[PDB]
Amino acid sequence: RQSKFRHVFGQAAKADQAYEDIRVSKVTWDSSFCAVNPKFLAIIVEAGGAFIVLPLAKTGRVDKNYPLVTGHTAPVLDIDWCPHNDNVIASASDDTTIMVWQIPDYTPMRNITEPIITLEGHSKRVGILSWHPTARNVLLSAGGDNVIIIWNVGTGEVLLSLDDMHPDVIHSVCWNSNGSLLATTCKDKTLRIIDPRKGQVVAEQARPHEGARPLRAVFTADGKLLSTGFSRMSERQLALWDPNNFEEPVALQEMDTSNGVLLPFYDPDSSIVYLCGKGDSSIRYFEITDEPPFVHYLNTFSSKEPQRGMGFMPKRGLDVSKCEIARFYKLHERKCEPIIMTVPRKSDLFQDDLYPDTPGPEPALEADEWLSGQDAEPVLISLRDGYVPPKHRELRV
C-alpha cells in the first residue's frame, strides 16, 4: 500500500527540552490532564484543584514555589485552550464550576485565584470542556448531571442547555470541524450525533454493537466518527462509523486487553489518528483512507515508561521547517517529555502537501450569529507565514 506516511516516526526530545519536577494529578479521570497551545503547556497537578501553566520556553526544573492556577475547591478534571486567544484557558472541576482564565506572558507573584468569569450551570462534577471551533467565546461543558451546556464566555449566558438527552453518563462530547454538530458516547453503550441548535439526536445506534462500550468519539474531516472503547471481551477497539449506516462499523481494529481508555488524537490534514491511554508506554498510529480496510496501521512509538496523561500541540505550534506533523507532551509521574512525530522529507522547502491551510486564531462567526443558525468554515491561515498571534489579547467579560 503506497502511503506518504509510511515512514512517520516518533523521537523523544533531548533531556534538557523536558519540564521536570511537576507533580501530575493522580486523580482517577480519563481526560488527558494536559492542554498545550503555541505559547503554553498546561498540566493538571496534585493539589482542592490546581493546574500549572508554563511558557513553552521555560524548560528544565520547575521551581518548588512556581505559581499555580488554584481557583477551584475540588480536583480539576479538564482544561482546554481558547482556539481564538492563546492566553485564555478554561478549567472544569469536581466543584461543579467552569473557570475561564487570563494567562499572563510573565510569571505572577503568587497562585492565580481570580478568573475572568466563573460559569455555574451544572449540579454535579464538570469533566468535559470543548471550545467551539468557529464561534467567538462559545464554550461547551458536560457534567455528571448528564447535561450539555453551551456558554457565551463573554456574557456568562447559557446559549443552549441539553438536559436529559442521554439516559446515562456522558463519557465524551466532540464538535465537528465547523461546530454544527456534536458526537457523544454514553454509558448506555451507544454513539449519538446531536444537532444542539435543533435540540435533536440526528443519528444514533439503535442498540450497542456486539455489547461493545464506546468511551471516546471524534469526527473525521468528512463527517464519519472514529470511536475508541472496549469489546464485550474487554479488547480495546478503534472503530470507524458512517453515521448514515450506524448498525455496522466501516472498520474495526481490536488491539490488547489493557485497562486504559484510549484517547484518539486525530490530524484531519494527514488523516492520521494517534491512540494512547493512561498507563500505556506506547503511541500507536493509523492512517484513515477510502482504500479498504480504511483504517491502516502505520507504526508505534514505544517506550518503557507508562504515561500519566498526554498533550497534543495544535498545528500553529508545529515546527514546519523540520517536517514535524505532531508533537505530544507525555506526562510522567514528575515530568513532561515532548515526543516529536516527523515525516522525513529531508527538504529545506516548505512541504505544502503536509501543511495545507489550517484554522487560525480568528473566529468565523459571533456567538449570536452561530446561535441564529449560521454555519461558516473556520478562517484558515498558512503555516508558512510562521506564528501569527491572535488579534484578541484580553478576553473582556
XYZ file of C-alpha atoms in Angstrom:
397
model
C 0.000 0.000 0.000
C 1.511 3.382 -1.128
C 1.250 5.908 1.795
C 3.043 9.268 2.088
C 3.046 8.497 5.891
C 4.828 5.092 5.561
C 7.986 6.455 7.294
C 6.392 8.694 10.014
C 8.455 8.143 13.208
C 8.478 9.430 16.790
C 11.512 10.715 18.697
C 11.702 11.800 22.361
C 13.030 15.386 22.800
C 16.510 15.896 24.393
C 16.545 15.565 28.245
C 17.030 19.397 28.517
C 13.809 20.036 26.436
C 11.684 18.341 29.181
C 9.719 20.052 32.026
C 10.920 18.459 35.325
C 9.671 18.337 38.982
C 5.875 18.694 38.187
C 3.501 16.586 40.414
C 0.989 15.344 37.741
C -2.540 14.747 39.183
C -3.174 11.035 40.023
C -6.979 11.619 40.318
C -8.839 8.768 38.501
C -10.351 10.538 35.447
C -9.901 9.568 31.748
C -9.211 13.117 30.381
C -5.663 13.798 29.083
C -4.753 16.144 32.071
C -2.660 18.245 29.649
C -3.626 21.150 27.320
C -0.905 22.713 25.084
C -1.062 25.674 22.624
C 1.645 27.531 20.642
C 2.634 29.608 23.759
C 1.934 27.437 26.840
C 1.914 23.964 28.440
C -0.935 23.420 30.978
C -0.925 20.340 33.261
C -3.414 19.280 35.959
C -1.309 18.805 39.157
C -1.610 17.084 42.578
C -3.421 19.630 44.861
C -8.631 21.464 46.213
C -7.914 21.660 42.460
C -4.862 23.134 40.681
C -3.121 23.186 37.301
C 0.222 24.683 36.226
C 0.757 26.872 33.129
C 4.341 27.023 31.779
C 5.568 29.214 28.894
C 6.940 26.635 26.362
C 10.447 28.270 26.511
C 10.703 27.567 30.333
C 12.200 24.039 30.029
C 14.120 22.230 32.825
C 13.381 22.043 36.583
C 10.194 23.874 37.694
C 10.842 25.824 40.950
C 9.126 24.286 44.054
C 7.420 27.740 44.524
C 6.244 28.075 40.851
C 2.767 29.721 40.879
C -0.312 27.537 40.121
C -3.884 28.269 38.978
C -5.844 27.394 42.177
C -9.371 28.966 41.955
C -11.236 25.602 42.175
C -12.161 23.973 45.544
C -12.045 20.330 44.254
C -9.947 18.475 41.642
C -9.623 19.882 38.116
C -10.931 17.316 35.595
C -10.445 19.063 32.214
C -8.601 22.036 30.699
C -8.915 23.462 27.129
C -7.193 26.479 25.456
C -9.387 29.042 23.640
C -8.864 28.473 19.861
C -9.112 32.258 19.210
C -6.961 33.522 22.155
C -3.623 31.853 23.044
C -3.692 33.483 26.572
C -7.173 32.130 27.575
C -7.731 28.647 29.129
C -10.921 27.141 30.624
C -10.827 24.679 33.553
C -13.655 22.325 34.692
C -13.772 20.883 38.217
C -15.353 18.306 40.552
C -16.535 21.541 42.354
C -19.294 21.742 39.574
C -17.846 25.039 38.148
C -16.007 26.121 34.982
C -13.450 28.942 35.332
C -12.009 30.896 32.377
C -8.527 32.351 32.999
C -6.455 35.211 31.501
C -2.859 33.817 31.466
C -0.065 36.442 31.752
C 3.016 36.233 29.452
C 5.118 36.790 32.667
C 5.320 34.802 35.971
C 2.795 36.112 38.559
C 3.924 36.739 42.200
C 1.555 34.095 43.709
C -1.080 31.494 42.696
C -3.711 32.779 40.207
C -7.059 32.537 42.127
C -9.323 35.092 40.271
C -10.624 34.002 36.821
C -12.174 36.286 34.127
C -15.516 34.510 34.835
C -16.935 31.515 36.753
C -19.712 29.580 34.940
C -22.161 27.885 37.403
C -24.755 25.791 35.476
C -24.075 22.154 36.468
C -25.329 20.448 39.692
C -22.539 17.771 39.543
C -18.845 17.494 38.506
C -17.832 19.092 35.164
C -15.427 16.618 33.487
C -15.736 17.670 29.811
C -14.931 21.022 28.088
C -14.672 21.865 24.391
C -14.360 25.362 22.911
C -16.390 25.928 19.738
C -14.097 25.851 16.671
C -15.570 28.890 14.774
C -17.942 30.953 17.036
C -16.316 33.668 19.220
C -16.406 32.919 23.007
C -18.642 29.802 22.617
C -17.684 27.001 25.108
C -19.275 23.565 25.638
C -19.342 21.813 29.051
C -20.815 18.429 30.008
C -21.354 17.353 33.637
C -22.200 14.354 35.860
C -25.788 15.745 35.735
C -25.754 14.340 32.109
C -26.421 17.949 30.909
C -24.514 19.552 27.989
C -24.327 23.374 28.312
C -23.201 25.729 25.509
C -21.982 29.039 27.039
C -21.131 32.547 25.828
C -17.953 33.111 27.910
C -18.070 36.886 27.092
C -21.505 37.399 28.745
C -21.694 34.332 31.089
C -25.051 33.494 29.345
C -26.283 29.913 28.698
C -26.951 29.803 24.893
C -28.298 26.189 24.905
C -28.947 23.646 27.711
C -29.293 19.985 26.531
C -30.558 18.227 29.716
C -31.609 14.517 29.755
C -30.778 13.897 26.031
C -28.635 10.976 27.379
C -30.226 8.254 29.575
C -26.865 7.618 31.382
C -23.335 9.041 31.960
C -21.876 11.043 29.021
C -18.232 9.840 28.502
C -17.213 12.281 25.694
C -18.514 15.220 23.602
C -16.796 16.429 20.365
C -17.630 19.264 17.905
C -17.372 18.544 14.145
C -14.981 20.803 12.153
C -17.454 23.749 11.682
C -19.172 23.282 15.116
C -22.614 22.456 13.577
C -22.883 19.011 15.301
C -21.832 17.080 18.439
C -20.745 13.433 18.744
C -21.278 11.803 22.152
C -20.581 8.475 23.842
C -22.830 7.217 26.657
C -22.694 4.531 29.420
C -25.800 3.056 27.621
C -23.078 1.860 25.117
C -24.265 3.930 22.097
C -22.918 6.714 19.874
C -25.067 9.777 19.112
C -24.748 12.674 16.673
C -26.660 15.703 18.060
C -27.701 18.982 16.404
C -27.507 21.208 19.512
C -29.360 24.216 17.950
C -32.228 21.833 16.871
C -32.071 20.067 20.306
C -32.316 16.727 18.454
C -30.347 13.474 18.132
C -29.890 13.325 14.304
C -28.106 9.890 14.207
C -27.781 7.169 16.885
C -27.016 3.449 17.275
C -30.406 1.709 17.901
C -28.511 -0.695 20.284
C -24.914 -1.439 21.445
C -22.707 -3.092 18.724
C -21.945 -6.693 19.905
C -22.082 -5.428 23.550
C -19.079 -3.083 22.947
C -18.651 0.089 25.139
C -17.590 3.279 23.204
C -15.806 5.766 25.560
C -14.431 8.383 23.068
C -15.526 9.569 19.620
C -14.210 12.272 17.272
C -15.350 13.427 13.815
C -13.196 12.781 10.742
C -12.811 15.651 8.230
C -15.602 14.047 6.056
C -18.083 13.635 8.984
C -17.517 9.948 9.854
C -16.849 9.030 13.511
C -13.725 7.447 14.984
C -14.553 5.810 18.336
C -12.411 4.033 20.963
C -13.712 1.696 23.645
C -13.827 -1.942 24.797
C -15.329 -5.089 23.189
C -17.713 -7.459 25.071
C -14.442 -9.342 25.949
C -12.549 -6.151 27.194
C -10.426 -5.900 23.975
C -9.507 -2.244 23.293
C -11.064 -1.187 19.949
C -10.745 1.600 17.363
C -13.811 1.802 15.089
C -14.747 3.946 12.066
C -18.523 4.675 11.729
C -20.624 6.007 8.827
C -23.476 7.731 10.739
C -25.824 7.114 7.702
C -25.459 3.316 8.481
C -24.750 3.096 12.270
C -25.535 -0.681 12.741
C -22.075 -1.944 11.481
C -18.662 -0.178 11.654
C -16.888 0.632 8.316
C -13.715 -0.685 10.077
C -12.838 -2.197 13.484
C -9.280 -2.627 14.846
C -9.055 -4.743 18.065
C -5.740 -4.441 19.915
C -4.958 -5.515 23.526
C -6.879 -6.421 26.740
C -5.261 -3.451 28.646
C -7.372 -1.402 31.165
C -6.864 2.228 29.990
C -9.306 4.309 27.890
C -7.523 5.070 24.559
C -7.645 8.816 23.704
C -7.855 9.472 19.929
C -5.741 12.381 18.643
C -6.926 12.993 15.082
C -4.957 15.004 12.439
C -7.569 15.946 9.761
C -4.875 17.185 7.264
C -2.843 13.895 7.316
C -5.943 11.792 8.134
C -3.861 10.147 10.946
C -5.202 9.085 14.360
C -2.799 8.546 17.281
C -4.003 6.395 20.212
C -2.714 6.230 23.763
C -4.217 5.900 27.222
C -3.174 6.403 30.822
C -0.852 3.514 31.752
C 0.243 2.919 28.105
C 4.004 3.175 27.292
C 3.261 3.358 23.508
C 1.606 5.664 20.935
C 0.002 3.654 18.111
C -0.953 5.474 14.920
C -3.131 4.738 11.902
C -3.944 6.341 8.521
C -7.655 6.702 7.519
C -8.293 6.401 3.703
C -11.147 5.250 1.373
C -8.997 2.219 0.314
C -10.139 -0.902 2.273
C -9.570 -1.748 5.050
C -9.918 2.094 5.527
C -8.095 2.099 8.916
C -4.405 1.376 8.147
C -1.854 0.718 10.931
C 1.317 2.841 10.330
C 3.589 2.299 13.359
C 4.043 2.529 17.135
C 6.288 4.820 19.180
C 7.423 2.521 22.046
C 8.900 3.328 25.478
C 9.448 1.608 28.860
C 7.540 4.453 30.705
C 3.719 4.414 31.271
C 2.067 7.817 30.615
C 0.035 9.688 33.303
C -1.532 11.957 30.628
C -0.807 13.448 27.203
C -0.945 16.830 25.468
C -1.091 17.339 21.694
C 0.273 20.519 20.023
C -2.141 22.320 17.652
C -0.990 22.965 14.035
C 0.060 26.612 14.760
C 2.713 25.289 17.218
C 4.381 22.662 14.936
C 7.929 23.219 13.606
C 7.109 23.058 9.857
C 10.823 23.675 8.979
C 11.585 20.180 10.481
C 8.508 18.384 8.907
C 7.079 17.941 12.453
C 3.444 16.720 11.861
C 2.630 16.177 15.580
C 4.135 16.946 18.975
C 2.989 15.057 22.059
C 3.563 16.296 25.629
C 3.841 12.988 27.550
C 3.106 13.174 31.311
C 5.257 11.026 33.607
C 4.830 10.943 37.436
C 7.070 14.081 37.902
C 7.872 15.439 34.399
C 6.548 16.328 30.917
C 8.557 14.916 27.940
C 7.851 16.133 24.357
C 7.662 13.413 21.643
C 8.104 14.723 18.050
C 6.427 12.962 15.060
C 8.284 13.611 11.759
C 7.554 12.929 8.058
C 11.226 12.665 6.945
C 11.344 14.678 3.641
C 14.993 15.924 4.201
C 13.994 19.209 2.444
C 14.598 22.923 3.250
C 11.422 23.695 1.204
C 8.015 24.232 2.875
C 6.149 20.895 2.366
C 2.691 22.190 1.207
C 1.179 18.700 0.877
C 1.848 18.134 4.653
C 0.733 21.644 5.739
C -2.475 22.729 3.994
C -4.082 25.980 5.222
C -5.436 25.353 8.758
C -7.910 27.015 11.160
C -6.398 30.236 12.514
C -6.934 32.270 15.690
C -9.760 34.487 14.252
C -13.381 33.323 14.729
C -15.566 32.929 11.583
C -18.815 33.886 13.480
C -20.027 35.807 16.533
C -21.869 33.768 19.234
C -25.269 35.324 18.285
C -24.764 34.582 14.514
C -23.958 30.930 15.340
C -26.968 30.646 17.716
C -29.249 32.106 14.946
C -28.203 29.069 12.813
C -25.372 30.456 10.596
C -22.630 27.904 9.666
C -19.169 29.037 8.466
C -15.940 27.151 7.727
C -13.044 28.147 10.019
C -10.992 31.185 8.895
C -7.839 29.459 7.518
C -4.212 30.671 7.805
C -0.986 29.468 6.134
C 1.647 27.790 8.372
C 4.411 29.122 6.028
C 3.861 32.681 7.483
C 5.175 31.380 10.908
C 3.394 32.168 14.251
C 0.553 34.755 13.691
C -0.708 35.968 17.130
C -4.491 36.177 17.784
C -5.943 39.743 17.285
C -7.533 39.317 20.812
C -5.117 39.526 23.844
C -7.566 40.208 26.772
C -10.996 38.420 26.666
C -13.233 41.189 28.224
C -16.432 39.996 30.086
